[PDB]
Structure 1
């Protein structure tokens, strides 16, 4: 059986610029630096994230990872995002029981979500 999540790997054109983005917004903790290729490992809220430098670029889509935050934190995270001038999506339509979320991109078409809801709340079906 699957024990759980091992890690998430992302490809970016500029590793040092992405590093700063991760360290600033997600308080990412760099735990490794290159090797087969140029890469860095970060710990983000317990999750092992791998960033590799490459010219590969996925077209933008709703395929994304979302991190858990608290409702009372949506505004502060919003100010933080605006400050770095990163691109933010507008309010997405949602149903009752679906908490607030903010969406923004990195520099390589990676959509990230900060969700203030709980799976339990969305199970009023």
Structure 2
């Protein structure tokens, strides 16, 4: 029986730029040979994430990891993501009680989401 999530691993080109992304946006906590595949582990809210050198290097897709946030800090988060100059999907016009998410990319084509409110998939607003 599956006992829990063990980790997620992502391949990026540049571990320092991805480190900056994970620390600035998610307050990722970094835990820790001449390798060509250098790597790093972080914890973000109970999740172990490995970043390892490789190729950014795919296509963009709608696959994504969503992290939960409070509704009250959606605007703050949006401003930090905007500070990294990464690609964001502009938030659309919204009605009251419509739960908010932010969709945006890292430097290697991965799509992330910060999700507040009721669990659901919101990509179809874009």
Fold agreement, TM-score > 0.5 = yes
CA positional deviation for 1:31: 0.3
* 1:27-76 C-alpha deviation (Å, 9 max, x unpaired): 00000398683100000111000000012522101100100001001000
Superposition misfits of 4+ residues, deviation over 3 angstroms: 33-36, 92-98, 119-125
CA RMSD of superposed structures (Å): 3.9
- Please say if residues 97 and 121 of structure 1, whose CA atoms lie closer than 8 Å, have aligned partners that are also in contact: no
Instruction: Give me the whole-angstrom Cα distance separating, in 2, the residues matched to 1:124 and 1:59.
Output: 19
Q: Normalised by the size of structure 1, how large is the TM-score?
A: 0.84
Which of 89-98 and 10-19 deviates more? 89-98
Is there any run of 5+ residues in structure 1 with no aligned partner, and where? none
Which of 41-50 and 90-99 deviates more? 90-99
CA positional deviation for 1:83: 1.6
Which of 54-63 and 96-105 deviates more? 96-105
Q: Normalised by the size of structure 2, how large is the TM-score?
A: 0.84
Which of 54-63 and 23-32 deviates more? 54-63
* 1:61-98 C-alpha deviation (Å, 9 max, x unpaired): 11001000010010000111112212111236999976
Is there any run of 5+ residues in structure 2 with no aligned partner, and where? none
- Please say if residues 56 and 109 of structure 2, whose CA atoms lie closer than 8 Å, have aligned partners that are also in contact: no
Count, aligned residues: 125
Instruction: Give me the whole-angstrom Cα distance separating, in 2, the residues matched to 1:74 and 1:124.
Output: 19
- Please say if residues 98 and 121 of structure 1, whose CA atoms lie closer than 8 Å, have aligned partners that are also in contact: no
